[PDB]
DNA sequence: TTTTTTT
DNA sequence: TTTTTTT
C-alpha cells in the first residue's frame, strides 16, 4: 500500500540510482535512447531489477498496475525535465517485463482482474492497425465550448450528449483537436502441448498500443505482460464477463 | 421444517460434536485445513455423517438447500470465530456430498426445482473460466451515488436504469468497486450403459463457482450434487423455463 | 348447456354408478389405481362409456372441455374425499379418449377453436422437458403482498406490473411459492400416404403436461385428444392466428 | 349508382324471380341446397344471369363489390327468413362468377383497385389453413366492458388501446367472444406459355375465407373472381403498393 | 429564366399557333386525338418544333423541366377549356422528345441533376405494374380530420405522424380517398455496341407512369427523355445519392 | 507552420514564377489547359517542383493538406483573375503528386491522420459513380429561408433539424440550389507478391470526386496521394476508428 | 411484390 | 469469449 506521490519519487530514484552488477545505471542509458535520431516511446523496465532495488514497490505495479505504471511514467517524465532539460518529449510508456508468476491462458481467473499478470502462449490472430482515440475532444456547435474526455482501448466510446457550458444537445467529436494512437487487437492461446489430452486450448484477446503495435505475427511464441481487464459479453444480458489483456509489454521467445 | 437461526447452531454443534467410529471429530480436522499454508475455501460434508447425528436437519439441506447450505456456512463461520479466534478468513463453502437419492439426468424434473439433488453422469462440455460478478456495484455519473446489487450466476444481470439518489438515468457498472468470482459452465448427460435399448441420453447444463471451477474435463465420470434451478429461455414472455444445475459439490469416479 | 355445479355431481355419479356389460364399475377400479404403491395422477375416461350413461354430458366435454374436464376433476376429487376418506392426494387429471369425430391434421379448422377434438397422425418432433409455471405466485418487494396468477401452457406469461395492495411497481416472480409442472412440446403431421400424390403435409404443434409428458418419440403413430387453441401469428401484428393442440390424452397405435 | 337498401330488395327479387331458358328459378334450387344434410354456406351467382335480369345491378357488384356482395348476402338472408321460415342458418356468402372482363395477372392495374375483377391463372402456392379473427371482441379487465371491432383479412389487426366505458388502458382480446373463420393464402401467376417474349411472368397473392378455403392445390388452373386490394410493401417506406386479391369465388378449368 | 405564368401562355400560343412546313397546326391535330373514341392522355411535343418557334422557352423545359412540363400541361388544359369547351377531360401529360443533347448512360452525372435529359440505351429489366399513390389522403381516427399529401414516385413515402386538427398521433392512410396511378420500374444500360470493347456497361434505373407504363420490354432499344433524379443512398445517413430517371417520354428505335 | 493568407500568395508566386531546367513556367502552360475547348478542372502539381522552389511550403501541404490544398486552389483562382481576366471559370482542384515518403497500405497509421500521404497499391474494387452533395442548401417550407451547409465525402450527411430564421422544424434539402459532384468509392490493398506470401494483405478504402472519378478499374496498379481520414466503425460503441483515403491525385503505373 | 406455423 | 475495415 503506497500512494502515487511517493511512488513517482521512488521510481525516479530507482531509474537514476539503480545499478546492476557492473555499476551500469542502465535506466539512464534507456532514458537516453529516448532522445536520439530514431527515438523510442517507452522504457523497458525489468521487474527483477525493480524488485532487488525496491521490492516493496515492485509488489505494487503487480497489485495495482494502473497507479504503478502511471506513476512510473510521471517518473520518467521528471528525470527528463530535470536531468536532460527536456519537456518537449511526448508521453513515454513504462513497460514492465519478466515478472515472477507466469500464468497460462487457462489459469487466468477473476483473481487477476486489474492486476498486472504475465502470460506465455502463442499468437493465433492479429487485427488491422486501427486509430484509437486516446483523448476524445468534443466540441459544441452552438457556443463552441470544448470538452476533454480520455478514452480506454477496451471500454466503449464515452461520448457526451449535453454541453457543459450552454447545455445544448448538439455536440460533435473534433478529430483534429483529439489525440490518436495506433491500436491492434490480437489473440493468444496456450500451446497445445502444455495441455492435457482432452483439453480445449483456451484463448485470450489482447490490445496493443503505440510502439508495441505490429510487433507480433500469427504463430509467434510470446510472453506478454499486461493488465487483465473485464467487460460484458457482446449481448450484455448476463452477469458473466469477457477477459481482455491490455498488454503492457510483449517479448518473443524461440522454444 | 427448520428455520435458519437454529440450523446455524445445530450445524455448529454437528461440526464440533460429530465423531465417526473412531472418535474423529473429522470436521474439526477440516476446519483445520482451512487455516494452513495452502488453505481451501470449502468444507466437504458427507451427508450420511450429518444424517446419523441429526437426520431431521439432513432432511432440510435436501428440501431447502438455499437455507441449508447458507446456514451451515454461517456455522463454519462461527466455529472459527469462537474456537480459533479467526475472523479474517473469507467465506467458506459448505459442500454436501453422498446423498441417499441419486438421480439420472433423464429423471430430473420440476419436482426437484430448488431442492438439492444428486446426479451421476458424464461431462460432455466445459466452458471458459469466466469472471462472474457475485455482487455488482453501480455508480452514478451525475451525483456519484453508489448502489449495491447482488447477482445470481444463473439469473440474468440485474441492472438499474435510474439513480436511487438524484434519479439520473446515467448509471454505469464500476468494475473495481464490484466483487468477482471464477465461474465455469459445463454439461453432463446420462451414462449410456445405464440407459435401456433405443433410448437417447438426455443432458443438463450446470454452473461451477470459486474452488470447484475447472475441476472436470470433457469425458469425466462425475457425481455432482446440486440445486436444480430454472429460468425462461430465448424470450421472456413464455411460462416455460430451462433446467440449470447449480453444482454444490462435484466428485470424480472411475467406473 | 349444463353449468359446472351439476356437471360435478353428474360426473361423480357417472364414475361410481357406471357399469359395463359385466357390471364392472371400471371407474371405481381406476380411482383405486390412484392410491396404490405406484400411483397414477389421471383417470382415463372412455367417451363412449360417458355417452352411453349420459350423452347429454358427453356432448359438453366436447363443446366445452375447459369446464367439462375441470368439473370431472372435482368429481374425482369428491369420490375420493367421500368414498375413500382421502384428501391428501394431489390433483388428478380427467383425460377423455375415444371420441366420435376423428380429424386429420389438415382438416383442423376455425370451427374447432376451443372444442375438444381427436386427431390421428405421426409425431415428427419432441421438445426438451422444461418446467412450466402453472401457477405464478408474484411477490411485492415493498409490502410483501402475494398475488396468484394461473398460467396457460400455450398463452404467453401473464405477469403483473403493479401491486394489488400498495400499488408498487416493484413486483417479482417467486419460484418457490409458485407451482411448476413438467412440459414438453411436440409436432404431428398428416401421414404423407393419405395425402395426394406430389402434395405437401400441414402439421400441428402440441403441448404435453405432467404425466403425459415424454410419452412419445419422433416417428410414433398416435391418436391424441385435445383442445384446439389459437394465438397471434408470432409477431402479434396481424389478424391471423396459430393452431396449438393442448393435449388432453395421447394413445399410440401400431398400423 | 344504387344504394344498399334497394340493392338488397332487387337481389331478393332476382333470386326468387329469375328463371333461365326452362323456367328454372335455379337460385331457389340453390337456396335449397343450403338447408339439406350436407349444407353449403354460399350461393354461387352467375353474373350473366344477374346481368340479363338486372344489368344495372350487375354493374354495381363490379364497380362496388363491398356493397354489392354484402347486399346480396342480406337478400339471401331475407329469402330464407320469409320463404322458408329459417333464421337459425348462419351467414351465407354471395359468390359471383363468370364476369365479362377476364384479366391477366400482368394486366391487373391501379384502375381495378377495389373493383371486382376476374383473373385466369395458375396456382403456384397455397398457405396453411389458419384461423382468422373476422370480429375481434375486446374485453376490459377493469370494468368488463365489451367492444366489437370487425377485422379485414388483408389489413393489419386493429386493436383498441383505451376502454370506451371507463377509459382504462387495460384491454385484452377475448378469444371465445370473438368470431373466427378459416383463412388460406395462395399465389397465382400467368403461365410462361401465355407471354409475349421479353416479359417475365407476374404473380399475385390472394386470400380465401370460409367455404372457399382449401379448394385449390399448387398446379391447378383456376379462374378466380375477387376484389383487387392494395397494401404497403412490407417496409412501408415508399408510396408504392402491393396487389392482393380478396377472392370472392374460385372455379377450376381443365385446359 | 421565365416564370410559370408566362410559360403557360407562351405554350398555349405555341400549341395553337405553330405550323410546320405545310402550315399544319399539328398540335391542334393532337389536342384533337385527345377527345376521340380511343383517347390518349398525353401530347407528344417535338423539341425542335418548340425550339424553332420559341427557343428561349425550349431552353427552359431542359433547364427547368418541373416548371416546364407542368406549365405546358396547364397550357393543354387551357386550349381545351377555351377552344373545345371541354373541362371534363382529366389531366394530360406534356411529353417532350427529340432534344439536341443525347447522352449515353455512362455520361449521366451530377451535372444533369433535375435537368431534362435524353438517353439512348437498351432495356435490361422491367418491373411489375404496381399502383402508385400519386396523391395520398390521411385520415385521423380520433377527430376524423382529412389531410392531403401529394407523393412523388422516386422519393420515399411521406406520411404524417401527428394530426393537423386535434394533434392525435393516430393517423392512417385511407386507400379509397387516395388517388393511384400505374407505375412501372425499368433498367437501361448502354447498348454494348458504341462502347469500347473493354468497358463494363453502366446502367440506370427509371420510372414510368400512367400511359407510358408497359411500353417496353427487356431487349428493346429505346430513346428516353427524362428528369435525372437523386435520393439519399441506402442508410440515408451518408451525403451520397442514387441516380433515378423519371421518364418523360420513351420511344423505340430499330438499329 | 504557415497561415493560409501567405500560402495563397506563396503559391500564386510558385505557379507563375517557377521554371524548370529549361525556363518553362510549366504551371502557366497548365493554368492555360484550363481555359481551352476541352477544359480540365484541376492543376497537377509535382511536389518536387514545389519543394525545390519552396521546400518550407511543400512541408505544409503534407503536414496540413486541408489548408495547403485549399490555399493553392485560391492561388489558382487568383492567377486566373489577374493574369487572364477570367472569373467565370468554376472551381479548380490542386492535385499534388510524386511525394517523398511513399507508404504501403499496412504501414498507414494514426500518425498520418489528416496528413497528405502517398500510397502505392493495387485496386481491388470500384463502386458506382453516385452523386455527392458537396454543398447542401437546405430550404425552409414555412418562411422560405435558405441555409448553406458544406458536406464532406467521408463524414455522414449533416442536416439541420431547425430553421435559422423562424425555427420551423420543417426543413428540406433543395436539390437544385445545392452543388453536386460525381463520387466513386474504391479499395486498394498492398500486393501480396511484394509482401511475404505468408501474410494476409491489408487494404484501405478511398474516395474519388469530380474529374478523378472513374480513373481506375479493379486490378490496376496505382500510386495515389491523399488525405488519411478517420471515422468510427459502423456500430459506434468503440473509440476505435476506420481509415479512409480521400484521394487528392491518382496515377497508374505498369510494373 | 414475398419466400412455411417454428426451426 | 469473437469471427476481421464490408456488400
Ligand atoms: Zn455549448
Ligand atoms: Zn445520481
Ligand atoms: Zn406492495
Ligand atoms: Zn373499462
Ligand atoms: Zn384529429
Ligand atoms: Zn423558417
Residue numbers in the entry:
A (entry chain C), B (entry chain D), C (entry chain E), D (entry chain F), E (entry chain A), F (entry chain B): 0 to 254
Paper text:
Hexameric MCM rings act as the replicative DNA helicase, encircling the leading strand DNA template at the replication fork. Each Mcm subunit contains three domains. The N-terminal domain (MCMN) possesses an OB (oligonucleotide/oligosaccharide binding)-fold and usually a zinc-binding motif. The MCM complexes of several archaeal organisms consist of six identical subunits and have provided powerful models to investigate the atomic details of MCM structure.
The structure is similar to those of MtMCMN and SsoMCMN with three subdomains: a largely helical subdomain A; a Zn-binding subdomain B; and an OB-fold subdomain C. The central pore of the PfMCMN hexameric ring is oval-shaped with a variable diameter around the ring reflecting a significant deviation from pure sixfold symmetry. The RMSD of the C-subdomain Cα-positions from the sixfold permutation is 3.03 Å and 1.45 Å for hexamers 1 and 2, respectively. The ssDNA circles the interior of the PfMCMN ring in a plane perpendicular to the central channel. When viewed from the C-terminal side of the complex, the 5′ to 3′ direction of the bound ssDNA proceeds clockwise around the channel. The structure reveals that the individual MCM subunits do not all simultaneously participate in ssDNA binding. The subunits that interact with DNA use a consistent binding mode with four nucleotides per subunit. DNA-binding is consistently observed at the first subunit if this distance is less than 7.5 Å, and it is not observed if this distance exceeds 8.4 Å. The most significant interactions between PfMCMN and ssDNA involve two adjacent arginines, R124 and R186, that project from the β-barrel of the OB-fold towards the ring interior. The DNA-binding consists predominantly of interactions with the sugars and bases rather than the backbone phosphates.
